[PDB]
Amino acid sequence: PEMVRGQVFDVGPRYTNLSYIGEGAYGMVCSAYDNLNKVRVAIKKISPFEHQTYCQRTLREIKILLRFRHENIIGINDIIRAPTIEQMKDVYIVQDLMETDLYKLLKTQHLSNDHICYFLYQILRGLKYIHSANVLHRDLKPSNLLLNTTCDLKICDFGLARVADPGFLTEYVATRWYRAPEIMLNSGYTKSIDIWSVGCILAEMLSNRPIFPGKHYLDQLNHILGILGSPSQEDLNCIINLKARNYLLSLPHKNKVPWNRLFPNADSKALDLLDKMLTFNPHKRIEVEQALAHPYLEQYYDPSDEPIAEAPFKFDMELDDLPKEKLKELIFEETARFQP
């Protein structure tokens, strides 16, 4: 079996010609050639079985991705794992090859307004489908937006996703920069948190820098307040947790920084939409369908070509309590359909 950067990829004979793309906490992704369909693919090696949370996130990702079918959401084409549960130490997820992601792209080049508009459209088109399935992604960020050379965009990594149907994000080790204010104020389960993240992504496309790069929960909140200014009394009155409300009330007043000052080269319609996504009050924050219908995206908006899920997504089990041995059993069962 071919080795990549000191890791054995047992994907042959079907998959060969492997080269490193990126890596996470418990996985590495590579470009590869599929000798059967004569096409270039991406293969993700996942080794989660010694860690309960890795198992949970892996199971969630697999279940969601196998159920979802949308042009702007990464699919799973094949899964490679061992014929027996004891032998299974690694899982290989085969997906469509996406050459890069928005994180890497923004590190290397400034985007034209045309690209920003088209990318935003696809993000929101994908998100419309996710939300129509009653799923919250919860971890939208540039590195979770996969891109190819022809400007197709696919949302990935549903490891932290949840169904909005009655888990705290502040209990996970993850980038906090794209998190809605209500999350730090200790509240984390409306569709509106995803819209905030998209707003943060838009801001990042406009300037090539994260708008709110907080280092901890209080810093994250303070970064947001630095730009939006202190919330109005009206918006304070909508914060249900009194401690959080009184904390915000107590801070020295901060004036809003106007968006056109932060982003002096941005399209004015783009900043209008940005404002509506980066709205402090989650009830007043724009919804995904309303965002798609915004004048900035008029070039692409077409509700008859923006499909929805035909049924709400549901987890058949509570995963958060399960020991990693049981989670492994469930991963084994879920991947069985790809076995001969």
Partner: peptide
Amino acid sequence: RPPDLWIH
């Protein structure tokens, strides 16, 4: 759609 991306 906008033109292709030169990826580095």
